[PDB]
Amino acid sequence: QAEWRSWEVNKRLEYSLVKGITEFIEQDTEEARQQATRPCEVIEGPLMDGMNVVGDLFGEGKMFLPQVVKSARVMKQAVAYLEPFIEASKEQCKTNGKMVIATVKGDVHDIGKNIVGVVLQCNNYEIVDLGVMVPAEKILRTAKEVNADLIGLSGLITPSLDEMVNVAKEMERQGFTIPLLIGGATTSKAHTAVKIEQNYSGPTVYVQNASRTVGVVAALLSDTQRDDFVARTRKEYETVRIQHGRKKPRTPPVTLEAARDNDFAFDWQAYTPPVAHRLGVQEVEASIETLRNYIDWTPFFMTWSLAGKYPRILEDEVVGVEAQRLFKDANDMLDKLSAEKTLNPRGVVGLFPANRVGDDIEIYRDETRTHVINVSHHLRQQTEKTGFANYCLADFVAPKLSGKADYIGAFAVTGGLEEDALADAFEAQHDDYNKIMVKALADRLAEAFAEYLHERVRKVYWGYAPNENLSNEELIRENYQGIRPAPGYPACPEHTEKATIWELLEVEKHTGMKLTESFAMWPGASVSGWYFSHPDSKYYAVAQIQRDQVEDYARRKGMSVTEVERWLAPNLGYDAD
Ligand code: B12
């Protein structure tokens, strides 16, 4: 009765792998397994005779990642069935190469890595994933214990770039020869070509996306290009170095002295800082239903590699259809989670009295302005300014020497602690779709809580806009007074400051969230930052900070001048080691 259920199980298998169907997969995988001598011919047969189809159609714009992930599911549920008949009839069976991929020790961003991960499992490459915040040691060990042909690391935070150079050294100090691919959006063909490739006498290549990966990995293993490639790359990474070496610099830096003097000019005498309708640290929660109306689906589609800016992306004559069903499944999931409460976004907010002092934000235990409960430290742009001031988030706060009782706030929210468990849940049932789906949503609900919270802060809590009324649109455009910078962003690059935010809020004590070693957060889908009210506070980039400030900062933090140089490596205005 089903026109497609009337074909050879080897052509319906290609169908199941294309139209993503696991309903008749176990039979369409067993039938071809019985019509097969040694159990693995199906693996290298109709499975790949279909994956190569999934790929070819993928590259012709006749498929998209969202679908390829549903295809990879059938391919894994098909292999999750032929695992036994190959455990008792071990034959290994050929692939296109094995590779150990993992998220640089300390970092949490993994989806971008899990995408490139399957994109290769669609080219018959075996990908022994390791996860996030994985120690460079475990990574190399795996490379050996599994005799991998390559190693791909992924990191999007600042500490990453440093923990990556570590692996390059270890591979070079332990005799490795397999290539070393650096991954991440933040990681550039520059940092890789200047601060990493030179620490490993082996192939160290960078890739922009999960699309280029397939191309690179290929000509990196091919016995007819592997040489033309490597040489071509090394000669290129040579250009980058000398290129940025010449542009080093174009805009001369400045002294922390002349910098602080040329600070955000503003007459605090005329102005009068808006008092906080409230003060203290209050735990806060919000149903998924409440947050759903704050979600920014733009990045959501942007994750599944779908060019578009919601909602117009739902129309787009290209992926409009896919963007829809994806958006459908997304919501359909949020529905079950919101009803079953199987996921509950949690968070905490706080408001304290504070004042600026040089480049720091003194935080008092109460209006008395006597005893300090902590001090938020902030850097200051250190390049030559023309017409503008070397901005520092400290400026936007009333200088202690003005009496103007100013205030500052902080927060830390998560799309729920159940992220991990849920992810592993689908992980077991071999379903990368919902696994990456829930992770993506957790991120959404997470950032959604950040807006929803900040709103109630601008309106109620802080109270400098109680009658403020905006639609999700205006919010994304940031149609409001004040900014909510967070540790890591160009405004406040120093990551260890997350410490302060976790201190002042007793976050783990009110939310459960935790800070690892590289000052990463938990669960993965979690955000935390500050709150500033001053109607002129804007997001800028600290840029390049010179020595004199690294020291002075290491002095205010009590951190070893060197250790500091590490956390702000990408921001250092010189070439330290
Ligand atoms: C979603 C997201 C998050 C999630 C993370 C969960 C997850 N699994 O991804 C959430 C909302 C929780 C978050 C929080 C934070 N984030 Co964030 N986040 C993003 C965002 C919007 C997109 C990145 C993303 O996932 N993209 C989609 C994927 C598919 O793309 P991709 O990672 O770039 O991958 C492509 C390639 O680069 C490549 N690639 C990647 N992996 C690999 C591996 C190999 C082997 C190879 C060869 C290539 C390769 O393949 C991909 C194509 O598919 C960005 C903005 C941006 N500019 O990218 C910031 C960004 C990464 N975040 C940033 C920061 C500041 C933070 C926080 C510290 C903020 C805070 N709360 O205080 C925290 C991290 C701590 C924590 N534990 O939560 C910065 C980093 C800057 C810095 N100096 O540190 C960014 C760049 C923003 C900015 N412009 O400043 N984040």
Query: CA-to-CA distance for 174 and 190, rounded, in angstroms?
Result: 25
**Two tokens at 101?**
């991929």
Tell me the CA distances in angstroms from 390 to 52, 182, 239, 533, one per residue in order. Answer: 54, 33, 32, 19
CA dihedral angle for residue 436, residue 439, residue 442, residue 446, rounded to 10 degrees: -110
Catalytic residue among 107, 149, 263, 395: 107
Query: CA-to-CA distance for 532 and 409, rounded, in angstroms?
Result: 7
CA dihedral angle for residue 72, residue 77, residue 78, residue 82, rounded to 10 degrees: 130
Q: Which CATH architecture has domain 1-87?
A: Orthogonal Bundle (1.10)
- Domain at 286-345: CATH code: 1.10.288.10
Which atom number of ligand 1 is nearest to the Cα of residue 490?
90
Annotated catalytic residue 107: yes
Which atom number of ligand 1 is nearest to the Cα of residue 415?
12
Task: Give, rounded to a whole angstrom, the gap between the first and last alpha carbons of the chain.
Answer: 70
Pairing of strands 126-129, 98-103: parallel
Contact between 507 and 412 under an 8 Å Cβ cutoff? The reply is yes
- Select from 76, 68, 63, 89 the least CA-distant residue to 29: 76
List the beta bridge partners of residue 377.
Answer: 360
Query: CA-to-CA distance for 323 and 15, rounded, in angstroms?
Result: 22
Query: CA-to-CA distance for 438 and 433, rounded, in angstroms?
Result: 9
Classify domain 93-245 at the CATH topology level. Answer: Rossmann fold (3.40.50)
Judge if 1-87 and 93-245 fold alike in CATH terms: no
**Two tokens at 566?**
């590490």
Which backbone phi and psi does 150 adopt, to 5 degrees?
-150, 170
Pairing of strands 180-183, 150-154: parallel
Report which protein residue has its CA nearest ligand 1's atom 41: 113
User: 311 preceded by cis ω (within 30°)?
Assistant: yes
Phi-psi domain of 387 (left: phi exceeds 0; alpha: psi -120 through 50; beta: other): left
Contact between 181 and 216 under an 8 Å Cβ cutoff? The reply is yes
Concatenating the DSSP letter of every residue in 255-310 gives: -HHHHHHT-----TTT---PPPS--EEEEEE--HHHHHTT--HHHHHHHTT----T
Query: CA-to-CA distance for 517 and 524, rounded, in angstroms?
Result: 14
Q: Where are the domains of the chain?
A: 1-87, 93-245, 251-285+346-577, 286-345
Q: Write the single-letter amino acid at 421.
A: A
Q: Is 540 in the pocket of ligand 1 (CB under 6 A)?
A: no
Q: What's the chain's Rg over C-alpha atoms?
A: 26
- Select from 548, 150, 172 the least CA-distant residue to 379: 548
State the residue for tokens 């909602």. 311
Q: Write the single-letter amino acid at 231.
A: A
- Select from 489, 490, 491, 467 the least CA-distant residue to 480: 467
Tally helices (H) and strands (E) across the chain: 21, 11
Axis crossing angle, helix 111-120 with helix 432-456, rounded to the nearest 10: 160
- Select from 563, 533, 156, 490 the least CA-distant residue to 354: 533
Report which protein residue has its CA nearest ligand 1's atom 44: 183
SS3 373: strand
Question: Could you tell me where the DSSP H helices lie in 429-534?
Answer: 432-456, 472-477, 498-505, 507-510
Report which protein residue has its CA nearest ligand 1's atom 28: 112
State the residue for tokens 């919902």. 434
Q: Which CATH architecture has domain 251-285+346-577?
A: Roll (3.10)
Concatenating the DSSP letter of every residue in 110-163 gives: -HHHHHHHHHHTTTT-EEEE--SSB-HHHHHHHHHHTT-SEEEEE--SHHHHHH
Experimental method: X-ray
Which backbone phi and psi does 134 adopt, to 5 degrees?
-90, 125
Angle at the Cα of 161 (from 159 to 166), degrees rounded to 5? Answer: 95
Tell me the CA distances in angstroms from 156 to 114, 162, 187, 343, 480, one per residue in order. Answer: 14, 11, 7, 26, 29
Query: CA-to-CA distance for 116 and 101, rounded, in angstroms?
Result: 10
List the beta bridge partners of residue 531.
Answer: 409
Which atom number of ligand 1 is nearest to the Cα of residue 439?
8
List the beta bridge partners of residue 414.
Answer: 346, 526
Contact between 319 and 304 under an 8 Å Cβ cutoff? The reply is no
User: 249 preceded by cis ω (within 30°)?
Assistant: yes
- Select from 218, 473, 484, 187 the least CA-distant residue to 351: 484
Query: CA-to-CA distance for 207 and 189, rounded, in angstroms?
Result: 8
Could you count the other beta carbons within 10 Å of the beta carbon of residue 99?
25
